[PDB]
mmCIF file of C-alpha atoms in Angstrom:
data_model
loop_
_atom_site.group_PDB
_atom_site.id
_atom_site.type_symbol
_atom_site.label_atom_id
_atom_site.label_comp_id
_atom_site.label_asym_id
_atom_site.label_seq_id
_atom_site.Cartn_x
_atom_site.Cartn_y
_atom_site.Cartn_z
ATOM 1 C CA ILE A 1 0.116 -0.148 0.064
ATOM 2 C CA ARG A 2 2.518 2.621 1.100
ATOM 3 C CA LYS A 3 6.028 2.955 -0.250
ATOM 4 C CA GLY A 4 8.713 5.561 1.004
ATOM 5 C CA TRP A 5 12.515 6.075 1.780
ATOM 6 C CA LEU A 6 12.998 4.942 5.195
ATOM 7 C CA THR A 7 16.555 4.590 7.004
ATOM 8 C CA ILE A 8 17.818 1.504 8.803
ATOM 9 C CA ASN A 9 20.017 1.877 12.028
ATOM 10 C CA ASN A 10 22.220 -0.675 12.391
ATOM 11 C CA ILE A 11 23.340 -2.560 8.989
ATOM 12 C CA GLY A 12 25.293 -5.808 8.740
ATOM 13 C CA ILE A 13 28.563 -6.158 6.617
ATOM 14 C CA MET A 14 26.656 -8.239 3.821
ATOM 15 C CA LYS A 15 24.169 -5.653 3.210
ATOM 16 C CA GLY A 16 26.313 -2.363 3.284
ATOM 17 C CA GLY A 17 26.480 0.559 5.382
ATOM 18 C CA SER A 18 24.136 3.487 6.758
ATOM 19 C CA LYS A 19 21.722 3.912 4.037
ATOM 20 C CA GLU A 20 18.156 4.974 3.600
ATOM 21 C CA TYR A 21 16.039 2.484 1.494
ATOM 22 C CA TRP A 22 13.024 2.044 -0.293
ATOM 23 C CA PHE A 23 10.353 0.476 2.000
ATOM 24 C CA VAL A 24 7.461 -1.219 0.379
ATOM 25 C CA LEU A 25 4.707 -1.694 2.766
ATOM 26 C CA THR A 26 2.035 -4.252 1.884
ATOM 27 C CA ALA A 27 -0.854 -5.637 4.041
ATOM 28 C CA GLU A 28 1.228 -8.912 4.091
ATOM 29 C CA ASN A 29 4.703 -8.029 3.823
ATOM 30 C CA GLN B 1 31.663 62.147 -55.961
ATOM 31 C CA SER B 2 30.980 58.723 -54.281
ATOM 32 C CA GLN B 3 30.949 60.530 -50.737
ATOM 33 C CA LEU B 4 29.224 63.682 -51.968
ATOM 34 C CA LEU B 5 26.436 61.218 -53.117
ATOM 35 C CA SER B 6 25.469 61.129 -49.403
ATOM 36 C CA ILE B 7 25.322 64.894 -49.215
ATOM 37 C CA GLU B 8 23.021 64.720 -52.311
ATOM 38 C CA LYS B 9 20.771 62.320 -50.575
ATOM 39 C CA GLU B 10 20.738 64.718 -47.773
ATOM 40 C CA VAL B 11 20.302 68.050 -49.674
ATOM 41 C CA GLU B 12 17.523 66.541 -51.779
ATOM 42 C CA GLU B 13 15.436 67.194 -48.623
ATOM 43 C CA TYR B 14 17.194 70.564 -47.836
ATOM 44 C CA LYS B 15 16.270 71.548 -51.307
ATOM 45 C CA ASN B 16 12.598 72.719 -50.730
ATOM 46 C CA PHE B 17 12.449 74.530 -47.261
ATOM 47 C CA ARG B 18 11.524 77.550 -46.596
ATOM 48 C CA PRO B 19 9.922 76.367 -43.464
ATOM 49 C CA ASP B 20 6.514 76.435 -41.878
ATOM 50 C CA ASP B 21 4.868 74.669 -44.850
ATOM 51 C CA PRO B 22 1.764 72.612 -44.211
ATOM 52 C CA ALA B 23 2.316 69.777 -46.834
ATOM 53 C CA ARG B 24 5.793 69.214 -45.510
ATOM 54 C CA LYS B 25 4.867 69.205 -41.956
ATOM 55 C CA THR B 26 2.008 66.704 -42.241
ATOM 56 C CA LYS B 27 4.362 64.681 -44.385
ATOM 57 C CA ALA B 28 7.140 64.658 -42.064
ATOM 58 C CA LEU B 29 4.565 64.091 -38.913
ATOM 59 C CA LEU B 30 3.028 60.969 -41.029
ATOM 60 C CA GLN B 31 6.532 59.442 -41.797
ATOM 61 C CA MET B 32 7.598 59.924 -38.288
ATOM 62 C CA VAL B 33 4.596 58.088 -36.909
ATOM 63 C CA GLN B 34 4.974 55.444 -39.553
ATOM 64 C CA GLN B 35 8.726 54.729 -38.467
ATOM 65 C CA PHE B 36 7.786 54.738 -34.858
ATOM 66 C CA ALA B 37 5.089 52.108 -35.867
ATOM 67 C CA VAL B 38 8.174 50.098 -37.424
ATOM 68 C CA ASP B 39 9.820 50.507 -34.209
ATOM 69 C CA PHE B 40 6.628 49.081 -32.297
ATOM 70 C CA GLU B 41 6.459 46.113 -34.578
ATOM 71 C CA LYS B 42 10.445 45.489 -34.442
ATOM 72 C CA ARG B 43 10.863 45.778 -30.620
ATOM 73 C CA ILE B 44 9.633 42.405 -30.375
ATOM 74 C CA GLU B 45 9.843 40.817 -33.912
ATOM 75 C CA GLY B 46 12.093 44.630 -24.193
ATOM 76 C CA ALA B 47 11.775 41.212 -25.712
ATOM 77 C CA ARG B 48 13.959 39.245 -23.258
ATOM 78 C CA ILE B 49 13.442 42.085 -20.863
ATOM 79 C CA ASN B 50 9.444 41.076 -20.873
ATOM 80 C CA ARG B 51 10.004 37.215 -21.332
ATOM 81 C CA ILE B 52 12.152 37.284 -17.879
ATOM 82 C CA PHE B 53 8.946 38.296 -16.101
ATOM 83 C CA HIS B 54 6.917 36.185 -18.232
ATOM 84 C CA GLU B 55 9.141 33.032 -16.703
ATOM 85 C CA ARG B 56 9.684 34.867 -13.202
ATOM 86 C CA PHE B 57 6.228 34.692 -12.215
ATOM 87 C CA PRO B 58 6.044 30.859 -11.301
ATOM 88 C CA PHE B 59 9.045 31.843 -9.220
ATOM 89 C CA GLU B 60 7.053 34.256 -7.416
ATOM 90 C CA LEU B 61 4.351 31.666 -7.012
ATOM 91 C CA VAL B 62 6.678 28.921 -5.459
ATOM 92 C CA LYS B 63 8.281 31.471 -3.139
ATOM 93 C CA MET B 64 5.601 31.645 -0.365
ATOM 94 C CA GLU B 65 4.314 30.075 2.026
ATOM 95 C CA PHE B 66 3.244 26.461 2.656
ATOM 96 C CA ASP B 67 3.607 26.904 6.360
ATOM 97 C CA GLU B 68 3.058 25.505 9.184
ATOM 98 C CA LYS B 69 1.615 23.250 12.071
ATOM 99 C CA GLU B 70 -0.301 26.559 13.171
ATOM 100 C CA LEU B 71 -2.285 25.853 10.330
ATOM 101 C CA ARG B 72 -3.351 22.528 11.584
ATOM 102 C CA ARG B 73 -4.028 23.962 15.110
ATOM 103 C CA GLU B 74 -6.062 26.804 13.505
ATOM 104 C CA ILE B 75 -8.438 24.392 11.645
ATOM 105 C CA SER B 76 -9.058 22.620 14.740
ATOM 106 C CA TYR B 77 -9.792 25.816 16.280
ATOM 107 C CA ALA B 78 -12.255 26.371 13.565
ATOM 108 C CA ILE B 79 -13.827 23.275 14.314
ATOM 109 C CA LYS B 80 -13.995 24.572 18.107
ATOM 110 C CA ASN B 81 -15.764 27.534 16.621
ATOM 111 C CA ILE B 82 -18.156 25.461 14.741
ATOM 112 C CA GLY B 83 -18.464 20.412 15.760
ATOM 113 C CA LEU B 84 -17.522 17.169 14.237
ATOM 114 C CA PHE B 85 -17.204 16.585 11.170
ATOM 115 C CA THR B 86 -14.849 18.871 9.710
ATOM 116 C CA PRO B 87 -16.673 20.446 6.616
ATOM 117 C CA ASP B 88 -14.940 21.375 3.328
ATOM 118 C CA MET B 89 -15.632 25.114 4.037
ATOM 119 C CA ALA B 90 -12.564 25.288 6.227
ATOM 120 C CA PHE B 91 -10.478 23.420 3.299
ATOM 121 C CA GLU B 92 -12.167 26.451 0.900
ATOM 122 C CA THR B 93 -11.344 29.165 3.457
ATOM 123 C CA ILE B 94 -7.775 28.111 3.828
ATOM 124 C CA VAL B 95 -7.298 27.608 -0.120
ATOM 125 C CA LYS B 96 -8.674 31.116 -0.314
ATOM 126 C CA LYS B 97 -5.946 32.367 2.148
ATOM 127 C CA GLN B 98 -3.263 30.677 0.296
ATOM 128 C CA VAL B 99 -4.474 32.458 -3.229
ATOM 129 C CA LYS B 100 -5.261 35.471 -0.946
ATOM 130 C CA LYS B 101 -1.196 35.409 -0.400
ATOM 131 C CA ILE B 102 -0.569 35.115 -4.119
ATOM 132 C CA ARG B 103 -3.190 38.093 -4.955
ATOM 133 C CA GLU B 104 -0.293 40.676 -4.443
ATOM 134 C CA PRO B 105 2.469 39.022 -6.645
ATOM 135 C CA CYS B 106 0.017 38.913 -9.681
ATOM 136 C CA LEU B 107 -0.366 42.848 -9.185
ATOM 137 C CA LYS B 108 3.242 43.402 -8.819
ATOM 138 C CA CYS B 109 4.135 41.322 -11.720
ATOM 139 C CA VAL B 110 1.681 43.511 -13.760
ATOM 140 C CA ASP B 111 3.572 46.393 -12.372
ATOM 141 C CA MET B 112 6.889 45.181 -13.267
ATOM 142 C CA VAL B 113 5.376 44.382 -16.889
ATOM 143 C CA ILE B 114 4.205 47.764 -17.102
ATOM 144 C CA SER B 115 7.548 49.225 -15.776
ATOM 145 C CA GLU B 116 9.432 47.187 -18.460
ATOM 146 C CA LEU B 117 7.351 48.512 -21.221
ATOM 147 C CA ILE B 118 7.032 52.341 -19.733
ATOM 148 C CA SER B 119 10.559 53.082 -21.056
ATOM 149 C CA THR B 120 10.998 50.950 -23.984
ATOM 150 C CA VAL B 121 8.369 52.740 -26.037
ATOM 151 C CA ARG B 122 9.226 56.035 -24.924
ATOM 152 C CA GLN B 123 13.143 55.195 -25.359
ATOM 153 C CA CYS B 124 12.432 55.554 -29.322
ATOM 154 C CA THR B 125 10.845 59.071 -28.628
ATOM 155 C CA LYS B 126 13.748 61.012 -27.361
ATOM 156 C CA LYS B 127 16.268 60.040 -30.117
ATOM 157 C CA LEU B 128 13.881 59.873 -32.856
ATOM 158 C CA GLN B 129 11.640 62.640 -32.156
ATOM 159 C CA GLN B 130 14.136 65.314 -31.242
ATOM 160 C CA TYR B 131 11.535 68.269 -32.167
ATOM 161 C CA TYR C 1 21.736 -6.107 13.666
ATOM 162 C CA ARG C 2 21.629 -5.540 17.493
ATOM 163 C CA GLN C 3 18.993 -4.395 16.798
ATOM 164 C CA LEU C 4 16.910 -4.291 13.540
ATOM 165 C CA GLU C 5 15.797 -0.651 13.903
ATOM 166 C CA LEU C 6 13.934 1.700 11.427
ATOM 167 C CA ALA C 7 14.147 5.316 10.834
ATOM 168 C CA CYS C 8 11.506 7.931 9.930
ATOM 169 C CA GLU C 9 12.528 11.564 9.239
ATOM 170 C CA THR C 10 9.879 13.326 11.430
ATOM 171 C CA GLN C 11 7.182 12.316 14.339
ATOM 172 C CA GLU C 12 4.164 12.778 12.051
ATOM 173 C CA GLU C 13 6.204 10.416 9.686
ATOM 174 C CA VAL C 14 6.500 7.911 12.574
ATOM 175 C CA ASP C 15 2.914 7.969 13.427
ATOM 176 C CA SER C 16 1.798 7.840 9.539
ATOM 177 C CA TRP C 17 4.087 4.835 9.102
ATOM 178 C CA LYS C 18 3.073 3.077 12.235
ATOM 179 C CA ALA C 19 -0.727 3.596 11.463
ATOM 180 C CA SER C 20 0.137 1.849 8.253
ATOM 181 C CA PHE C 21 1.930 -0.877 10.227
ATOM 182 C CA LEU C 22 -1.286 -1.228 12.173
ATOM 183 C CA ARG C 23 -3.458 -1.217 9.198
ATOM 184 C CA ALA C 24 -1.165 -3.860 7.350
ATOM 185 C CA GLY C 25 -0.989 -5.958 10.739
ATOM 186 C CA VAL C 26 1.864 -4.879 13.266
ATOM 187 C CA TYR C 27 0.923 -5.206 16.775
ATOM 188 C CA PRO C 28 0.690 -1.970 18.410
ATOM 189 C CA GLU C 29 3.285 -0.682 21.016
ATOM 190 C CA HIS C 30 -11.014 4.908 18.365
ATOM 191 C CA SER C 31 -8.817 6.968 18.589
ATOM 192 C CA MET C 32 -7.182 9.898 20.451
ATOM 193 C CA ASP C 33 -4.751 11.520 18.137
ATOM 194 C CA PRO C 34 -5.137 9.174 15.028
ATOM 195 C CA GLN C 35 -7.154 9.745 12.594
ATOM 196 C CA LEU C 36 -6.955 13.626 13.191
ATOM 197 C CA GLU C 37 -3.484 13.556 11.636
ATOM 198 C CA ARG C 38 -4.418 11.403 8.808
ATOM 199 C CA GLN C 39 -7.780 13.676 7.973
ATOM 200 C CA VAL C 40 -5.611 17.019 8.104
ATOM 201 C CA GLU C 41 -2.590 15.286 6.141
ATOM 202 C CA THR C 42 -5.089 14.062 3.467
ATOM 203 C CA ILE C 43 -6.771 17.573 3.043
ATOM 204 C CA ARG C 44 -3.079 18.887 3.103
ATOM 205 C CA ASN C 45 -2.192 16.957 0.034
ATOM 206 C CA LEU C 46 -5.388 17.938 -1.526
ATOM 207 C CA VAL C 47 -4.242 21.465 -0.547
ATOM 208 C CA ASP C 48 -1.008 20.943 -2.324
ATOM 209 C CA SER C 49 -2.257 19.438 -5.503
ATOM 210 C CA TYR C 50 -5.049 21.863 -6.100
ATOM 211 C CA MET C 51 -2.413 24.387 -5.290
ATOM 212 C CA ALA C 52 -0.025 23.024 -7.935
ATOM 213 C CA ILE C 53 -3.012 23.063 -10.675
ATOM 214 C CA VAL C 54 -4.278 26.304 -9.777
ATOM 215 C CA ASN C 55 -0.846 27.867 -9.853
ATOM 216 C CA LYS C 56 -0.253 26.332 -13.305
ATOM 217 C CA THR C 57 -3.602 27.766 -14.576
ATOM 218 C CA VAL C 58 -3.275 31.135 -13.208
ATOM 219 C CA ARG C 59 0.125 31.242 -14.746
ATOM 220 C CA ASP C 60 -1.229 30.120 -17.966
ATOM 221 C CA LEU C 61 -3.988 32.789 -17.547
ATOM 222 C CA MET C 62 -2.426 36.039 -16.550
ATOM 223 C CA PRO C 63 -0.328 36.706 -19.853
ATOM 224 C CA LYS C 64 -3.796 36.355 -21.717
ATOM 225 C CA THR C 65 -4.936 39.176 -19.498
ATOM 226 C CA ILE C 66 -1.843 41.441 -19.925
ATOM 227 C CA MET C 67 -1.900 40.767 -23.545
ATOM 228 C CA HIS C 68 -5.585 41.539 -24.406
ATOM 229 C CA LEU C 69 -6.183 44.724 -22.479
ATOM 230 C CA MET C 70 -2.573 46.271 -22.751
ATOM 231 C CA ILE C 71 -0.659 45.124 -25.696
ATOM 232 C CA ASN C 72 -3.430 44.642 -28.105
ATOM 233 C CA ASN C 73 -5.073 47.722 -27.287
ATOM 234 C CA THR C 74 -1.896 49.591 -27.522
ATOM 235 C CA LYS C 75 -1.393 48.002 -31.016
ATOM 236 C CA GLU C 76 -4.647 49.302 -32.096
ATOM 237 C CA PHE C 77 -3.972 52.539 -30.389
ATOM 238 C CA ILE C 78 -0.735 53.337 -32.466
ATOM 239 C CA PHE C 79 -2.421 51.994 -35.591
ATOM 240 C CA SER C 80 -5.532 54.171 -35.528
ATOM 241 C CA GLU D 1 8.022 56.726 -51.031
ATOM 242 C CA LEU D 2 4.347 55.689 -51.513
ATOM 243 C CA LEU D 3 3.041 57.983 -49.236
ATOM 244 C CA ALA D 4 5.170 60.943 -50.469
ATOM 245 C CA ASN D 5 3.862 60.369 -53.896
ATOM 246 C CA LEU D 6 0.244 60.133 -53.103
ATOM 247 C CA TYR D 7 0.586 63.462 -50.999
ATOM 248 C CA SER D 8 2.238 65.199 -53.696
ATOM 249 C CA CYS D 9 -0.547 64.389 -56.181
ATOM 250 C CA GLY D 10 -3.919 66.034 -55.552
ATOM 251 C CA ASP D 11 -6.663 66.787 -54.860
ATOM 252 C CA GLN D 12 -7.212 65.897 -51.237
ATOM 253 C CA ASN D 13 -10.823 65.716 -51.592
ATOM 254 C CA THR D 14 -11.220 64.066 -54.946
ATOM 255 C CA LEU D 15 -8.355 61.513 -53.974
ATOM 256 C CA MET D 16 -10.920 59.578 -51.793
ATOM 257 C CA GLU D 17 -14.621 60.516 -51.688
ATOM 258 C CA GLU D 18 -18.092 59.400 -51.854
ATOM 259 C CA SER D 19 -18.929 56.491 -52.825
ATOM 260 C CA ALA D 20 -22.101 57.362 -51.598
ATOM 261 C CA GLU D 21 -22.743 53.995 -49.824
ATOM 262 C CA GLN D 22 -20.764 54.785 -46.862
ATOM 263 C CA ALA D 23 -22.404 58.134 -46.367
ATOM 264 C CA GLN D 24 -25.831 56.606 -46.645
ATOM 265 C CA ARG D 25 -24.475 53.540 -44.318
ATOM 266 C CA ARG D 26 -23.616 55.954 -41.644
ATOM 267 C CA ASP D 27 -26.761 57.819 -41.910
ATOM 268 C CA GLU D 28 -28.824 54.856 -41.622
ATOM 269 C CA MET D 29 -26.619 53.574 -38.584
ATOM 270 C CA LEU D 30 -27.410 57.182 -36.956
ATOM 271 C CA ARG D 31 -31.004 56.934 -37.758
ATOM 272 C CA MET D 32 -31.200 53.362 -36.384
ATOM 273 C CA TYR D 33 -29.043 54.665 -33.281
ATOM 274 C CA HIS D 34 -31.788 57.395 -32.661
ATOM 275 C CA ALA D 35 -34.797 54.788 -33.036
ATOM 276 C CA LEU D 36 -33.282 52.285 -30.785
ATOM 277 C CA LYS D 37 -32.060 54.375 -28.213
ATOM 278 C CA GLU D 38 -35.954 55.716 -28.289
ATOM 279 C CA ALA D 39 -37.161 52.282 -27.967
ATOM 280 C CA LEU D 40 -34.831 51.618 -24.897
ATOM 281 C CA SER D 41 -36.033 54.814 -23.528
ATOM 282 C CA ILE D 42 -39.664 53.489 -24.004
ATOM 283 C CA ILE D 43 -39.145 49.988 -22.346
ATOM 284 C CA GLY D 44 -37.503 51.882 -19.657
ATOM 285 C CA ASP D 45 -40.687 54.259 -19.250
ATOM 286 C CA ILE D 46 -43.081 50.997 -19.379
ATOM 287 C CA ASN D 47 -40.765 49.166 -16.671
ATOM 288 C CA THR D 48 -40.681 52.001 -14.375
ATOM 289 C CA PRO E 1 -12.939 55.240 -55.669
ATOM 290 C CA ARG E 2 -10.274 57.226 -57.571
ATOM 291 C CA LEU E 3 -7.385 55.809 -55.306
ATOM 292 C CA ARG E 4 -7.272 52.402 -56.615
ATOM 293 C CA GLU E 5 -6.402 53.733 -60.029
ATOM 294 C CA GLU E 6 -3.979 56.054 -58.532
ATOM 295 C CA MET E 7 -2.215 53.491 -56.561
ATOM 296 C CA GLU E 8 -2.161 50.933 -59.400
ATOM 297 C CA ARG E 9 -0.767 53.480 -61.978
ATOM 298 C CA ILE E 10 2.076 54.600 -59.500
ATOM 299 C CA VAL E 11 3.081 50.890 -58.654
ATOM 300 C CA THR E 12 2.830 49.952 -62.200
ATOM 301 C CA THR E 13 4.734 53.065 -63.226
ATOM 302 C CA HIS E 14 7.266 52.297 -60.323
ATOM 303 C CA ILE E 15 7.702 48.544 -61.958
ATOM 304 C CA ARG E 16 8.079 50.011 -65.259
ATOM 305 C CA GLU E 17 10.936 51.869 -64.080
ATOM 306 C CA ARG E 18 12.339 48.929 -62.210
ATOM 307 C CA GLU E 19 12.296 46.672 -65.301
ATOM 308 C CA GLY E 20 14.826 48.498 -67.197
ATOM 309 C CA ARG E 21 17.320 48.617 -63.826
ATOM 310 C CA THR E 22 16.509 44.581 -63.323
ATOM 311 C CA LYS E 23 16.967 43.865 -67.053
ATOM 312 C CA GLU E 24 19.923 45.719 -67.306
ATOM 313 C CA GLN E 25 21.292 44.179 -63.991
ATOM 314 C CA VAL E 26 20.430 40.516 -64.951
ATOM 315 C CA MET E 27 22.104 40.876 -68.510
ATOM 316 C CA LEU E 28 25.281 42.667 -66.780
ATOM 317 C CA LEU E 29 25.268 39.725 -64.173
ATOM 318 C CA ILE E 30 25.313 36.782 -66.577
ATOM 319 C CA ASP E 31 27.582 39.455 -68.745
ATOM 320 C CA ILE E 32 30.306 39.373 -66.165
ATOM 321 C CA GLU E 33 30.857 35.919 -66.111
ATOM 322 C CA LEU E 34 32.169 35.890 -69.858
ATOM 323 C CA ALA E 35 35.662 37.496 -68.931
ATOM 324 C CA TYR E 36 38.327 35.084 -67.766
ATOM 325 C CA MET E 37 37.192 31.553 -67.958
ATOM 326 C CA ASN E 38 39.491 30.234 -65.204
ATOM 327 C CA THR E 39 40.652 26.771 -64.695
ATOM 328 C CA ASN E 40 41.283 27.517 -60.767
ATOM 329 C CA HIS E 41 37.990 25.605 -60.033
ATOM 330 C CA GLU E 42 37.504 23.030 -57.143
ATOM 331 C CA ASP E 43 37.434 20.276 -59.833
ATOM 332 C CA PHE E 44 40.166 17.838 -60.736
ATOM 333 C CA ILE E 45 43.023 19.646 -62.124
ATOM 334 C CA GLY E 46 44.402 18.923 -65.812
ATOM 335 C CA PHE E 47 46.904 16.014 -66.101
#
């Protein structure tokens, strides 16, 4: 339903570093 | 002789006056008005000087205001004045206030355009018409 | 990631994303502050869209009112 | 040079003149003008 | 009336004053070209 830029605070080595991702919120996922 | 051809082309008009003649007066006035009209068609065909105001108008419209949480609290106070639910009249009143603050940019843009032209047309009245 | 944490830029954004989370199915941490913020924000977005389109159309319309009454009449004035 | 040549040649009256169509035309315009103004006055009189 | 005729006559007499100039000019223009007959053109040179 709702997409938007939102930042993760703590990010692992495999993902990357501090970054604001594009979250896609759905009623299931 | 070749450089005197310009003096011949100048004294061909100097050949017949004897001033204060109505024929030459009216012909001179009409040709001055005609070339003044030619300047009126060639001034555009203040071109960029007016087009900058033509493309400056969206800047003045984007510049103000879009603020702030006071508006949210104030429409809540409007509900306090009238209760639930919130009608569209508050929405209409607020968009009226927001075009109310754009009322003056339109008039000042008209002021700038007429100030842009108020010198352009008279610019060719001081150097063409020396009389 | 000690821990899995997510950031929102402001607090009304936190409230809007948590409200969307509650609508999607996240357990909470009818009603007091919602959905006054949702109603005002929806009207606020309507204000934004309507102001955008009305600014575009008045920006398209005011050259017509400065051409018709001023430039065209000045043209016919210098003509005849 | 066109305006100069046309202004040099004469006469001013016989250069462009009647053509009684335009004179009759403007006379009809004035007579219809007075008649319609009178009709507007009569209608105003009836309404008041 | 009486102006279309004067306008047309002045313009036609002007054109009849222009025709001698332009016929002389076009004949002179094509007549200049017969003087030197160069071989200094941009085409391929001899031999």
